[PDB]
Amino acid sequence: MFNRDMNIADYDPELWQSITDEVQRQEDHIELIASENYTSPRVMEAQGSQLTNKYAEGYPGKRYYGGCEYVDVAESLAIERAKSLFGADYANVQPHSGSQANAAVYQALCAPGDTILGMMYNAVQYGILDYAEIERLAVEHKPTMIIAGFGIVDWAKFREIADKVGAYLFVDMAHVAGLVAAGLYPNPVPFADVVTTTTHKTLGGPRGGLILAKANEAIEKKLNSAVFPGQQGGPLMHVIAAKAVAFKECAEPEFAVYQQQVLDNAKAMVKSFLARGYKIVSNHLFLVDLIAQDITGKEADAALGNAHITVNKNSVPNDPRSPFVTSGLRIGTPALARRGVNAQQSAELALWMCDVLDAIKDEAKLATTITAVKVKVAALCKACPVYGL
Amino acid sequence: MFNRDMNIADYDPELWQSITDEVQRQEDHIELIASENYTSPRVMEAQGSQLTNKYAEGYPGKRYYGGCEYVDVAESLAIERAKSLFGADYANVQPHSGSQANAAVYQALCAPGDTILGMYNAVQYILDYAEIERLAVEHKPTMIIAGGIVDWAKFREIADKVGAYLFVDMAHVAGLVAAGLYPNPVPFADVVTTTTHKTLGGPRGGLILAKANEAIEKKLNSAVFPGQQGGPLMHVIAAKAVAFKECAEPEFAVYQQQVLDNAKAMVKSFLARGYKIVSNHLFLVDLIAQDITGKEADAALGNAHITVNKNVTSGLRIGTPALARRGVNAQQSAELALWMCDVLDAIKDEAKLATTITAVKVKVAALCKACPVYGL
Ligand SMILES: [Cl-]
Ligand SMILES: [Cl-]
Ligand SMILES: [Cl-]
């Protein structure tokens, strides 16, 4: 028998220390990484459950393993809630990640060497979008699949183009999934043949992937087999349960309010950067372009980190520097807003970031500025705790 | 702020019901599915941690995101412990699953159109090492795939002869290898993969191991990321770290032999009762002689709270890793197999089947109560 009191702290203190350190880090650092969030304790509760013990290859009611009667309920809930949230006729909640969701779509709908028009295969690219040009490329190259993703993207126009040349329409709903769930951005599901997203970024759920589709029996069967046995074996049933409860949380009225906060916070930050003379490329994420100031993204993210502001360097369009250096920062506010930072605080935060960037060439002034900003960041982190009682 | 008291039971009673039902089922059903196990509360603690909130593309000390200084400790522990457990010079603990581990190896080592010798242009082969060598020389595989006791050194020799990579999927014997009960392929193969949740008894996920070879290590690094995956599941990687520490305890080797002892005991019981066995921790009960289908056996046994898979051989696939993990001993395993034979005989004889199912159910319930999976 496993004693239920077995724990990491007593057994594996070095590992435990890294965990408690990370917990503390999530409190006392402001996180501006666009692809991160903070998920609810209920999601973590499901991920920490005994459902990890169940092998469940196949789909609810159609498993290759016995004993799946109760995990079928959890998975069905996740599927039904995903369909409800996105007005889909089909949802596949087994993908382990966005990478596996996307791979499965490719395997479902394309054969290697097929042509693919987008933003093993013959790739054609397109670069506000010029739909006239996308259509011209579609007609010229006859893609098997057209991919669109995330201004306001016109899904109905992509459907029109796909229809014209008999292509599948694949939408990667990355970075607008939460806005779509909240009714704040046009839904690609009615227009695409298939839609993917991760479940941990703007949806704020567990780490994993999700496939959605409007009704098409043949495409749905291809998607089924592509996920399993195509890309995966057994799904992570504890993470699927976590997906079920996260999708329930995402349907709450509070979630649309949170999504608007995400947007308002980004707008406040943008207005501060612009007011301080920093160029923005822009939405819940934006780039701070650092060309005018001769600052590298690497240089800026290091300095901001020392001030307990975690951001990622990022190449600007046509960046003259390598991707390991870059001339920009990428900022997103999903995590900022999730921990309750408001638009005014976001505005001030960006101003603190500008104080750092302005001082970055002056060693003494930069040290002085980082010291000051740290104190301000600590006070904000304490005022807006991520988890607690 | 998330209030830390937020819970599933208060908020999502229907999901909670499915979870508490599954927990109870794990107690009151004997699980004989070969590829399942029961992982420790420490693994589950890690999987339920806040490490799920961290994006950490790249590898420790070489991330594409900031803020990874602490999760780097957890992943380095996982890597170091995998290396020490399997005597490898290289360990990649990021694969989300066995499938992802295997897919990364193909991408790292093979090109589209390459030839592959296993058991892409595919050529398939006691093992007949002569024929293996024959086929290798004949078709010049870019990669040979392998996985009683397999002679790893012979595969290395053959692979060397033709200048092929050697890839071992160790998933069926990983626990035995960790326990020193089966020859370790790691010194011989160029790359080894395994799951972490089957005979290793850890979190659900994948693992890649390799002997020192800087060129191959670089290819594997980039095959896993960005080749097959994006961000790793850092909460699950932490769970791998504590699982690998548990796998190094002397208790673990005792457990691995108990798995084998339990299988041997069940097999003797079936044979003694006239049921044909096809055959380490897995075996097949062939039901053709009695004219029992997998479906009706599976159904009857399931009603007696014995969870099996049906299986080509017609009948049951049985494995004992979970059985041994919850403390069922060999004598108990022998009796369990005899109870299963009572049910099977009742089907074939069409006699007292319902009563016999109930009888085995109450015996199974007592065994489950005597050998709880989790408790205080
Ligand atoms: Cl302990
Ligand atoms: Cl609650
Ligand atoms: Cl395993």
Side-chain angles (χ1 to χ4, degrees):
Chain A
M1 187 190 76
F2 288 115
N3 190 332
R4 274 182 186 293
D5 292 345
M6 291 167 67
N7 64 90
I8 302 170
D10 299 341
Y11 182 69
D12 196 355
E14 192 175 5
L15 181 62
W16 187 242
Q17 178 79 55
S18 79
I19 292 173
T20 60
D21 284 346
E22 170 59 19
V23 166
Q24 175 57 35
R25 192 205 59 79
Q26 287 174 23
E27 288 309 329
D28 65 21
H29 282 61
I30 285 295
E31 207 82 354
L32 294 181
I33 292 178
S35 80
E36 280 175 335
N37 211 323
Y38 309 110
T39 193
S40 86
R42 309 189 184 104
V43 161
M44 290 185 282
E45 185 181 359
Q47 296 200 134
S49 78
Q50 281 177 227
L51 274 56
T52 191
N53 287 336
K54 195 73 196 72
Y55 238 117
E57 291 188 334
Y59 292 105
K62 311 286 185 196
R63 301 282 192 196
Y64 283 92
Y65 284 78
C68 289
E69 296 81 6
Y70 304 119
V71 300
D72 283 359
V73 172
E75 190 170 340
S76 294
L77 283 173
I79 290 163
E80 289 301 326
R81 292 171 180 172
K83 284 167 55 185
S84 295
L85 200 61
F86 294 99
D89 297 293
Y90 171 94
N92 194 315
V93 300
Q94 302 200 356
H96 296 319
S97 71
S99 282
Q100 271 62 70
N102 289 4
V105 171
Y106 277 82
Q107 186 191 359
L109 302 192
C110 295
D114 276 352
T115 297
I116 298 194
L117 169 57
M119 28 168 229
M120 296 173 175
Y121 305 103
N122 176 29
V124 186
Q125 289 224 124
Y126 64 84
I128 182 171
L129 283 176
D130 186 12
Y131 297 104
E133 177 61 14
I134 294 158
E135 191 169 353
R136 183 192 75 70
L137 288 173
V139 169
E140 174 176 311
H141 291 108
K142 308 293 186 172
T144 299
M145 189 170 68
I146 299 169
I147 313 188
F150 178 90
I152 306 198
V153 183
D154 191 337
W155 311 126
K157 185 58 199 211
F158 276 101
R159 182 71 259 163
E160 191 182 305
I161 296 171
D163 278 349
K164 188 176 176 60
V165 307
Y168 289 113
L169 175 54
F170 169 28
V171 173
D172 182 332
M173 191 167 60
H175 288 306
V176 296
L179 294 177
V180 169
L184 299 175
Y185 196 97
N187 193 346
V189 168
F191 298 100
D193 292 296
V194 60
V195 176
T196 63
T197 181
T198 60
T199 47
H200 42 105
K201 301 175 157 103
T202 62
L203 292 175
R207 309 192 77 88
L210 177 59
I211 297 168
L212 302 151
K214 60 185 195 66
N216 189 303
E217 176 159 347
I219 287 175
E220 293 169 38
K221 293 181 182 318
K222 289 163 178 302
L223 290 170
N224 281 344
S225 302
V227 171
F228 167 77
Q231 301 303 309
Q232 308 189 167
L236 306 176
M237 295 312 303
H238 49 303
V239 181
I240 285 175
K243 284 172 189 178
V245 68
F247 296 157
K248 187 177 172 51
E249 296 176 352
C250 284
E252 294 293 354
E254 290 73 9
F255 185 78
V257 173
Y258 160 59
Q259 289 298 309
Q260 190 53 47
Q261 193 69 51
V262 169
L263 290 186
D264 293 343
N265 285 4
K267 178 178 154 184
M269 291 189 80
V270 161
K271 292 168 47 171
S272 282
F273 282 108
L274 293 171
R276 285 294 291 274
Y278 287 94
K279 180 177 176 186
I280 299 302
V281 192
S282 187
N283 216 326
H284 77 84
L285 71 82
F286 57 93
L287 310 177
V288 185
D289 169 286
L290 295 171
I291 296 275
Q293 285 82 3
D294 200 25
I295 307 169
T296 67
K298 186 182 166 76
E299 171 184 12
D301 103 68
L304 288 160
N306 282 338
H308 286 207
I309 299 169
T310 303
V311 306
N312 268 16
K313 73 191 187 292
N314 198 94
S315 300
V316 294
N318 298 329
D319 200 313
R321 294 173 172 113
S322 67
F324 302 107
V325 182
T326 80
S327 313
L329 299 177
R330 177 179 264 225
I331 290 172
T333 50
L336 193 68
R338 188 64 285 179
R339 66 179 300 165
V341 173
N342 66 27
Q344 184 48 59
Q345 292 165 324
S346 298
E348 290 167 12
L349 168 69
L351 292 180
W352 309 338
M353 295 177 70
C354 292
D355 297 341
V356 169
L357 294 171
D358 287 348
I360 220 164
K361 304 303 186 168
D362 186 337
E363 176 173 10
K365 176 55 184 327
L366 177 61
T368 291
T369 302
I370 287 175
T371 295
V373 171
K374 283 179 58 162
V375 163
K376 299 176 189 193
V377 168
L380 177 60
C381 285
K382 181 171 163 302
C384 301
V386 187
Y387 304 91
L389 308 133
Chain B
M1 190 192 71
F2 292 116
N3 166 21
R4 278 191 187 281
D5 289 341
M6 290 169 66
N7 65 90
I8 299 176
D10 292 352
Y11 177 75
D12 194 350
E14 198 184 356
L15 185 65
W16 186 237
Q17 183 71 54
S18 83
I19 298 174
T20 59
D21 287 348
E22 171 56 18
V23 164
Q24 177 56 33
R25 189 203 65 76
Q26 285 184 18
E27 291 301 332
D28 68 18
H29 283 61
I30 289 289
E31 205 81 354
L32 294 179
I33 290 176
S35 54
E36 273 175 341
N37 214 318
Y38 308 113
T39 195
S40 84
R42 302 190 191 105
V43 170
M44 291 187 282
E45 187 179 7
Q47 292 195 143
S49 77
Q50 282 178 223
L51 271 57
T52 191
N53 293 329
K54 195 67 190 73
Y55 233 118
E57 281 178 350
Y59 294 99
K62 294 294 178 184
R63 305 284 195 189
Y64 288 73
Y65 291 79
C68 293
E69 54 267 21
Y70 305 117
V71 297
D72 280 2
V73 174
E75 180 166 352
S76 294
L77 287 174
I79 288 163
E80 293 160 0
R81 288 171 182 170
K83 280 166 60 174
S84 155
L85 196 58
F86 293 103
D89 302 295
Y90 170 96
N92 195 313
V93 302
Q94 296 202 3
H96 295 322
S97 76
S99 289
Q100 266 65 67
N102 286 2
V105 177
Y106 282 91
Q107 166 171 9
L109 295 193
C110 296
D114 274 349
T115 295
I116 292 184
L117 175 63
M119 74 243 74
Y120 302 136
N121 271 283
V123 172
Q124 295 181 355
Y125 59 89
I126 176 35
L127 282 176
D128 186 339
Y129 294 117
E131 194 66 3
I132 298 170
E133 194 181 29
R134 184 196 163 261
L135 282 157
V137 191
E138 173 169 1
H139 299 109
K140 292 288 285 173
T142 283
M143 176 165 89
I144 299 175
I145 307 182
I149 293 174
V150 179
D151 193 338
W152 301 127
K154 191 68 185 171
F155 273 101
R156 174 79 271 154
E157 288 183 17
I158 297 167
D160 285 349
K161 190 173 181 64
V162 305
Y165 296 117
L166 176 59
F167 166 30
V168 175
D169 186 334
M170 171 177 80
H172 197 68
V173 299
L176 290 175
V177 168
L181 287 172
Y182 196 94
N184 184 354
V186 165
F188 298 99
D190 294 302
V191 62
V192 177
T193 57
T194 184
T195 50
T196 52
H197 41 98
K198 300 197 307 191
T199 60
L200 285 176
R204 199 163 291 271
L207 173 71
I208 293 163
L209 305 160
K211 65 185 187 64
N213 183 324
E214 198 193 4
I216 289 188
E217 293 174 37
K218 289 175 187 314
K219 293 184 202 282
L220 297 169
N221 281 346
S222 62
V224 167
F225 168 74
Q228 294 302 309
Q229 313 187 162
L233 307 177
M234 295 309 310
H235 46 306
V236 181
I237 281 171
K240 285 171 186 179
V242 72
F244 297 152
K245 180 172 171 64
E246 295 176 0
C247 289
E249 300 292 346
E251 285 91 345
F252 190 70
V254 177
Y255 156 61
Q256 285 299 316
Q257 183 58 47
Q258 190 72 61
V259 172
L260 299 188
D261 292 346
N262 286 7
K264 174 173 180 179
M266 299 188 80
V267 170
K268 300 212 316 153
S269 275
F270 283 111
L271 293 172
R273 293 285 297 271
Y275 286 91
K276 170 186 186 184
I277 297 294
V278 179
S279 215
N280 281 305
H281 69 266
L282 163 78
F283 60 90
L284 311 183
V285 186
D286 183 306
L287 300 178
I288 291 194
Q290 291 77 17
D291 189 19
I292 304 165
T293 66
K295 279 206 184 200
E296 63 194 329
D298 166 38
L301 291 164
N303 283 331
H305 292 193
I306 297 169
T307 301
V308 303
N309 281 345
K310 69 176 143 282
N311 195 66
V312 181
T313 301
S314 174
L316 302 176
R317 315 165 51 78
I318 293 174
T320 54
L323 188 67
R325 182 64 284 179
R326 63 183 298 165
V328 177
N329 65 35
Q331 168 72 263
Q332 290 172 318
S333 293
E335 300 299 76
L336 174 65
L338 293 171
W339 309 341
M340 291 171 75
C341 289
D342 295 337
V343 171
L344 292 168
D345 285 346
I347 299 170
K348 117 197 189 291
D349 293 339
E350 298 171 45
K352 288 194 172 187
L353 175 61
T355 297
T356 300
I357 285 165
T358 302
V360 174
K361 185 177 69 183
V362 304
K363 295 183 208 197
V364 164
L367 178 58
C368 287
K369 282 174 203 172
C371 299
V373 186
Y374 305 95
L376 297 188

